[PDB]
Amino acid sequence: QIKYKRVLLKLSGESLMGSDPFGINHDTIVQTVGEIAEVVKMGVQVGIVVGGGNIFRGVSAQAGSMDRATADYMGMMATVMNALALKDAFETLGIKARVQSALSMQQIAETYARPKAIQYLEEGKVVIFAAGTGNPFFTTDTAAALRGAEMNCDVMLKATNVDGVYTADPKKDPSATRYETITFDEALLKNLKVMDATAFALCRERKLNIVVFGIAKEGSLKRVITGEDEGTLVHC
Amino acid sequence: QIKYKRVLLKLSGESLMGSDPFGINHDTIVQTVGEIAEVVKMGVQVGIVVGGGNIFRGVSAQAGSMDRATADYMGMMATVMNALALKDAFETLGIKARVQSALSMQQIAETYARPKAIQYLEEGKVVIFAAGTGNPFFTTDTAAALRGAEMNCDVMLKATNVDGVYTADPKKDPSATRYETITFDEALLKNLKVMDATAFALCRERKLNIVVFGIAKEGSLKRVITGEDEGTLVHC
Amino acid sequence: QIKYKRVLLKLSGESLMGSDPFGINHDTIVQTVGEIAEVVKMGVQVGIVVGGGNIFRGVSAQAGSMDRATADYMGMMATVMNALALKDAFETLGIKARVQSALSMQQIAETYARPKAIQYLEEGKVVIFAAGTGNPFFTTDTAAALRGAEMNCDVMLKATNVDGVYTADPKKDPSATRYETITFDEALLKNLKVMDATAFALCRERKLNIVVFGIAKEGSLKRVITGEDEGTLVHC
Amino acid sequence: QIKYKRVLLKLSGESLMGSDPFGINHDTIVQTVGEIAEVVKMGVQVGIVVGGGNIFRGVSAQAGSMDRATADYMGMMATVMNALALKDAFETLGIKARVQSALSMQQIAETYARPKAIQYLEEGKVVIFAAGTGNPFFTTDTAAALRGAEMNCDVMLKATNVDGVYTADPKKDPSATRYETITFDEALLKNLKVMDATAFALCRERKLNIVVFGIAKEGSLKRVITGEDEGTLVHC
Amino acid sequence: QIKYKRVLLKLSGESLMGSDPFGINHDTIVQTVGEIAEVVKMGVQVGIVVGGGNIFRGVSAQAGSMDRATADYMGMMATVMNALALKDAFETLGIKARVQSALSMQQIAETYARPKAIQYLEEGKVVIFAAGTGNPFFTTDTAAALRGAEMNCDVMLKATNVDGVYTADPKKDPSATRYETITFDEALLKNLKVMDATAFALCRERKLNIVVFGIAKEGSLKRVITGEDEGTLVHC
Amino acid sequence: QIKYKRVLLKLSGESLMGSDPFGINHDTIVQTVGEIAEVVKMGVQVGIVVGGGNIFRGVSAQAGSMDRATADYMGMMATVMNALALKDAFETLGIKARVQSALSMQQIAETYARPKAIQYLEEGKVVIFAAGTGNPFFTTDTAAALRGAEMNCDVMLKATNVDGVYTADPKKDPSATRYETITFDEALLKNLKVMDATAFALCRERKLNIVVFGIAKEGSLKRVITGEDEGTLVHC
């Protein structure tokens, strides 16, 4: 029935953007939350680390002439916005969700705390991690590996705009094939794009396997959770 | 020389958007900052309260489907992003600035604390207040009034897309006139929309005068603080 | 049986003062807590926003020559004292209660957080909100509307020294009559005293109805909760 | 010239009450502040620990019926109120003052942090410590000792309703004498109540000398810091 | 069956040191946690205040030339380390444990809060109090009395390297006898070593009885909890 | 005169241990501090990131049996202890220093905040960063890089038990040579272990140059900041 009991779902801000060129598209987020809700109702404990690219865009231009760290702090503030909207959407579906921020925040969100988050998962709630790792110069993928290892998740579900890992950029090379399973070293030796070095190393060092898939492809989240053939499995 | 020593300048997030559809427009924010950097060098202590309408656009549509309290929190997060961008802008021009948030932030900003805010104002720095009043259901203009009165500002400068208060909409009828100066009661009596009732009410009770004025027009700010004829002055 | 499931009870500090000229009168608070306990045991979820006038009195005089904001901060510190004593009194009756402060406090009380407070209500505990809205220049009534709207309460129970809304000050006009029901506009058109403008506007804008009643009039809290004829109902 | 450079002055909340039955008496607080403003201008770094007995009166009766830990917390809240009032008083006389709380406060005060407190003392400001030790069951005098030793104060000044330590109660017998100077051991041996045992014990272990003295008597403070004959000196 | 329902177990850092000359000895802590686990599974609610002498040793030498307060802060940081390891050890045995610090800490531990800790005990979890009282110049024993009184524990279990209270130092006087029961005054009159004055006074003033025993003596924790003859009972 | 104006000096906890088996060795810490106190007086702004290996030794054995996240937290607590000891050392030599923690601490230290850290650096103070990145699974060297780049340091000084990077281990073969200067890519290509990959990767992306060098050797630090030939320089 269920292959992965506890998962850390990594969603980029862009995933909530749909076709729009900025922000959150109501239809996309509803479709996404609903799909996550489905696996939760199947009893899966879900942890979500969400990015802020969809909202950073509106401030990307100015970022250029800003101190990178500061630009990154705005990015983190952007994730919190997606975290909030994401939670609101779950409550609408009858699923309770809690937002834990890596940087302490008064009323918008609870501060990250391992014991509480684990509990929340157990209590059947979706835990949404905001503000990445709390530090600049680190990617969302990195924050996903960190929270994943901390939450003792069975695997990290890296959701992307491609339904898996290809021998080469499929969107620009129709003859590209999707790997069904690959190793960390293989991914490296083959210069395959899975995630940034730092995040990749963290997943290895913590023995956190990764499944790359395309969330927007209706039904694949459930397929991966159930063990069907979907996306690429990267293991150590 | 100087008409107003300490001023609380209210900036809508939209005033940093320029002609863009969303976010922060580089040339616009650089222009606005520069103009304030001008009065600052003239010995004016300036506190800023900024909205998040420009960034809120990308999540506005979704907001409608969300709880309002949660929507306002996203609005407050948006203002933090503008506050950082603004703060960084000032540094580039050699001016020192600090970001105070109504809600506690870990490393993005310092929590609001009157004694320190006033402290900075004396040290001749720019203080940008973010997160508004820290509470949902309150408008940015109310935050400005709150902070303006708390900071013991000589006047609140309401920057807007108009150079003053008119007896009628000039854009949709070039036959009206720009009030040079009105009184709170007259404004209310003549249904002149200066700001929402709560915000407006606070200024009166704290006896904080307002000066509505378009900041896009170069020189406008420089004019108001010097005492020239510019924008409407709502006083008591 | 029960007309209002979730209520925000607004108690002024003076209500806990009884006949004494300052502070908390043991007999009054016990009578008050007991009455609130009764409706909780009937299954009503109660949220309480409490004032500090009864304790502010001792420092009222000095306040006069103090900066208003500072005077207001003392008021907020006063509510926390009533919040504490109020909680202690419930624990004595076997009812668990939690104090959420609008301003973060280390060990005296938990910081306000919407998700937790809602939960507390559901868990059958009385939630007592202290420190108003966290900002100076705002009344307790305002803090009651805010928390009320945030807690999604069915109605706000404004407890006062009069058993309802009269055509004129009853304590000084024996021929005054009590309205059984009135509208927001009616209350305004008639210059009826319900609460301050800001708080009143917030209740309207959030569609939070109000029931004005006299808590000290033994048995009326239960009567209002049950639907009997008691106090004045102000709705939009 | 100056006998004590840095001093930790202990003020009971009652010493701000004057002849009133409760709260803060305007003329009294203005008198007391003024007297300290005097030694401050003389280059004395002054830290203050204030009790809350004056405000605690209005809730004392109820306290008896409450848990003691909770009662002490209300006592600590009371001290914050006096701290603010005191702080404001100093500003009026042109003196800068900061309020450090043992327990974290959001905007009412700054959390205690030694490096900053000492910082202020050097900057020639008045530092008023509130919330005592931050723990229930500890007396105000213990907080004074704690802070006195932490601040590396030359001496702790215990202001009281008496101008010194006597061989017997002078009020209830005008035949005793005011010890000019005693030693901790002598005090204990002769059962001279200077302060509770814990507080007293701390001063000795940290080697912090005490100077009991009535502050109501004009000039008293001025006398002690200058070295004149005034109040008992408990030393080691 | 069970004589003490809720206990505050005071463990010195040295107890976790075993024979080693520094730090935590895996075997000792496992033996200790297991023994505590046994009484928890019997339904006893356990509160633990732990010291840091075992880890302070490594920095004792440098402490000598440091400001005492600072030296004490390092001690508190040391308790947190034992608190952490202590918790980890319980989780391994299947017993949930929470670490509450007297000084607020972001992700390492929850800040001390009476309502939550009581709850935790009730929920069957072991609560471990770290950082003493939060202030320098106070012993661990003192922190044990404080938390004990706050948690309304039935008795404070002072674990030590001696199996009770002797007529004189047994390790250096073979003819020393163990008291089975003694009074506070008796302990004092006889100059018996139970704990430091401050801590002792606090236990008396709060009517918190004390049982002195040797935790390392396998099986005595259970014996004391069950009412058997073990250790010395000090009561008021 | 000065080669590097602002430097981020990385100190392993072991470098404060001297020849001892654990903890902090008085003569060693006094020597190391003194050496830095030297370059500071020369107008060099110095930020420090210190590890906790020296203190972690006493809990290392137990760590193996604990969850790694929890082990790393104990490691971070250890670094706070070294930070305090270090800070105190500087005071003794008349130098002012402040301790910034990645994780919020109540009174032991100030929470990390870039604007203030840079503030201090300009005020000519020593800033000691503790708790590393604030996240588990990240090495001390990564924290150094993070902070180094955040602080806009001219270079990161990696103090170690070796005076530079060699073509081969000199200790286990006196036939190699100390690279005078290498480039990131060369280092990686030649498998020269300078620091873990993540840490190393960050320095390159932020363009932060490293200068590996043994600090035990008196004069070493003094040499590097002046520009003399000392230790390997890994640049881009």
For every residue of C1-16, which 3-state class applies, written as one string? Answer: CCCCCEEEEEECHHHH
Helices (H), E99-139: 114-122
Q: What is the 3-state secondary structure of C52-97?
A: CHHHHHHHHHHHCCCCHHHHHHHHHHHHHHHHHHHHHHHHHCCCCE
Distance CA C187, CA C177 (A): 14
From residue B140, give the alpha-carbon distance in Å to each of B11, B78, C7: 9, 12, 29
**Nearest CA-CA partner of F14 in F35, F39, F32:** F32
Distance CA B171, CA C107 (A): 57
DSSP assignment of D144-207: HHHHHHHTT-SEEEEEESSSS-BSS-STT-TT--B-SEEEHHHHHHTT--SS-HHHHHHHHHHT
- Contacts with E115 from chain C: Cβ below 8 Å: 98, 110
A106 touches chain E (CB under 8 A): no
Entry field: residues in chain F: 236
Beta strands B6-11; A232-235: pairing state: unpaired
C65 touches chain D (CB under 8 A): yes
Tell me how close the Cα of C129 comes to any Cα of chain A, in angstroms.
14
Contacts of D58 (CB under 8 A, 6+ apart): C20, C22, C23, C24, C54, C55, C57, C58, D22, D23
Entry field: residues in chain A: 236
Does residue D40 contact residue D124 with C-beta atoms inside 8 Å?
yes
Helices (H), chain B: 26-41, 53-63, 68-92, 114-122, 140-150, 184-189, 197-206, 220-226
- Contacts with C103 from chain D: Cβ below 8 Å: 105-108
| Residue A126, both tokens | 């979706």
Q: Match 């019926």 to its residue by tokens.
A: D65
| Interface contact flag, D81 C77, Cβ < 8 Å | yes
Q: What is the 3-state secondary structure of C12-34?
A: CHHHHHCCCCCCCCHHHHHHHHH
Whether residue D34 is annotated as binding a ligand: the answer is no
**Nearest CA-CA partner of D52 in D91, D86, D8:** D86
Integer distance in angstroms from the first to the last C-alpha of chain D? Answer: 23
Beta strands E181-183; E232-235: pairing state: parallel
Give the amino acid at D21.
Answer: P
**Nearest CA-CA partner of B119 in D96, F117, D122:** D96
Integer distance in angstroms from the first to the last C-alpha of chain C? Answer: 24
| Interface contact flag, B107 F104, Cβ < 8 Å | no
| Residue D75, both tokens | 């006592």
Sign of CA dihedral B188, B193, B196, B199: negative
Distance CA A101, CA B143 (A): 25
Does residue D12 contact residue D53 with C-beta atoms inside 8 Å?
yes
- Contacts with E107 from chain A: Cβ below 8 Å: 111-114
F69 touches chain A (CB under 8 A): yes
Distance CA F138, CA F197 (A): 11
The minimal CB distance from C114 to the residues B69, B114, B149 is found for: B69
Instruction: Locate the chain C residue with the closest alpha carbon to A96.
Output: C115
| Residue A146, both tokens | 């960190």
Tell me how close the Cα of C99 comes to any Cα of chain E, in angstroms.
10
Q: Match 């902090």 to its residue by tokens.
A: F24
Q: Match 């204990």 to its residue by tokens.
A: D188
E110 touches chain A (CB under 8 A): yes
**Nearest CA-CA partner of D23 in D47, D58, D48:** D58
* Phi, psi of F228, rounded to the nearest 5 degrees: -65, 175
Does residue E62 contact residue F55 with C-beta atoms inside 8 Å?
no
F125 touches chain D (CB under 8 A): no
| Interface contact flag, D26 C65, Cβ < 8 Å | yes
**Nearest CA-CA partner of C87 in C57, C144, C139, C130:** C130
Distance CA A24, CA A88 (A): 13
| Residue D209, both tokens | 């000398």
From residue C206, give the alpha-carbon distance in Å to each of C148, C155, C165: 9, 11, 21
Helices (H), F50-157: 53-63, 68-92, 114-122, 140-150
Q: Which of D107, D108, D119, D123 to mutate to test the interface with B (most CBs of B within 10 A)?
A: D107
| Interface contact flag, F115 B98, Cβ < 8 Å | yes
The minimal CB distance from E146 to the residues D135, D197, D206 is found for: D135
| Residue D80, both tokens | 């914050």
Q: In CATH, what number is assigned to the domain containing residue B84?
A: 3.40.1160.10
**Angle CA D37–D41–D42, to nearest 5:** 120
Tell me how close the Cα of A198 comes to any Cα of chain F, in angstroms.
6
Beta strands F155-160; F210-214: pairing state: parallel
Contacts of A232 (CB under 8 A, 6+ apart): A164, A165, A178, A179, A180, A181, A182, A211, A212, A213
Beta strands B232-235; B110-111: pairing state: unpaired
Q: Match 């199947």 to its residue by tokens.
A: A42
Q: What is the 3-state secondary structure of B74-104?
A: HHHHHHHHHHHHHHHHHHHCCCCEEEEECCC
Does residue F201 contact residue A197 with C-beta atoms inside 8 Å?
yes
List the helix and strand counts (H, then E) for chain F: 8, 9
Q: What is the layout of strands, in order, in the sheet containing A181-183?
A: A110-111, A97-101, A126-130, A45-50, A6-11, A155-159, A210-213, A232-235, A181-183
Distance CA D218, CA C215 (A): 48
| Residue A5, both tokens | 């009991």
Chains near F with 3+ CB pairs less than 8 A apart are A, B, D, E
* Phi, psi of B99, rounded to the nearest 5 degrees: -105, 115
The Cβ of residue C188 has, within 10 Å, a number of other Cβ atoms equal to 14
Distance CA E228, CA E225 (A): 8
Tell me how close the Cα of D144 comes to any Cα of chain E, in angstroms.
13
Q: Which of B77, B108, B137 to mutate to test the interface with A (most CBs of A within 10 A)?
A: B77
- Contacts with F98 from chain D: Cβ below 8 Å: 115
Distance CA D201, CA A101 (A): 44
From residue D147, give the alpha-carbon distance in Å to each of C101, D81, E131, F211: 27, 19, 18, 44
Distance CA D17, CA D24 (A): 5
| Residue F187, both tokens | 């280092």
Helices (H), B126-196: 140-150, 184-189
Sign of CA dihedral F170, F175, F176, F177: positive
Does residue A234 contact residue A212 with C-beta atoms inside 8 Å?
yes
DSSP state of A179: -
Distance CA E182, CA E234 (A): 5
Does residue D148 contact residue D118 with C-beta atoms inside 8 Å?
no
Does residue B101 contact residue B135 with C-beta atoms inside 8 Å?
no
DSSP state of B107: S
Tell me how close the Cα of D230 comes to any Cα of chain C, in angstroms.
30
Distance CA F21, CA A90 (A): 54
Contacts of D176 (CB under 8 A, 6+ apart): D166, D167, D168, D169, D170
Instruction: Locate the chain C residue with the closest alpha carbon to D54.
Output: C58
DSSP state of A14: G
- Contacts with A114 from chain E: Cβ below 8 Å: 107
Full residue range of the structural domain in which residue C88 is found: 1-236
Whether residue F200 is annotated as binding a ligand: the answer is no
Distance CA F56, CA D47 (A): 38
B134 touches chain C (CB under 8 A): yes
Helices (H), chain A: 26-41, 53-63, 68-92, 114-122, 140-150, 184-189, 197-205, 220-226
Contacts of A200 (CB under 8 A, 6+ apart): A141, A184, A187, A188, A194
Instruction: Locate the chain A residue with the closest alpha carbon to F205.
Output: A137
* Torsion-angle region of F191 (φ positive above 0: left; ψ -120 to 50: alpha; else: beta): left
E181 touches chain D (CB under 8 A): no
Distance CA C112, CA C144 (A): 14
Number of domains chain C is built from: 1
Q: Kindly state the helix (H) or strand (E) to which residue E234 belongs, with its residue range.
A: strand E232-235
* Phi, psi of C178, rounded to the nearest 5 degrees: -95, 125
Whether residue B135 is annotated as binding a ligand: the answer is yes
Distance CA E91, CA A124 (A): 20
Does residue C156 contact residue C4 with C-beta atoms inside 8 Å?
no
Chains near A with 3+ CB pairs less than 8 A apart are B, C, E, F
Rg (CA), chain A: 17
Distance CA C108, CA A159 (A): 44
Distance CA E154, CA D174 (A): 48
Q: Kindly state the helix (H) or strand (E) to which residue F27 belongs, with its residue range.
A: helix F26-41
- Contacts with E134 from chain D: Cβ below 8 Å: 133-135
Distance CA D194, CA A119 (A): 52
Beta strands C6-11; E210-213: pairing state: unpaired
- Contacts with F150 from chain A: Cβ below 8 Å: 69, 136
Does residue B225 contact residue B156 with C-beta atoms inside 8 Å?
no
Experimental technique behind these coordinates: X-ray
Distance CA B139, CA E210 (A): 58
Provide the β-strand partners of residue D101.
Answer: D111, D130
| Interface contact flag, F69 A150, Cβ < 8 Å | yes
The string over D4-22, giving b where at least 16 C-beta atoms fall within 10 Å of a residue's C-beta and e elsewhere, is bebbbbbbbbbbbbbebeb
| Interface contact flag, D62 C106, Cβ < 8 Å | no
Q: Match 């699923």 to its residue by tokens.
A: A95
| Interface contact flag, B58 A24, Cβ < 8 Å | yes
C19 touches chain E (CB under 8 A): no
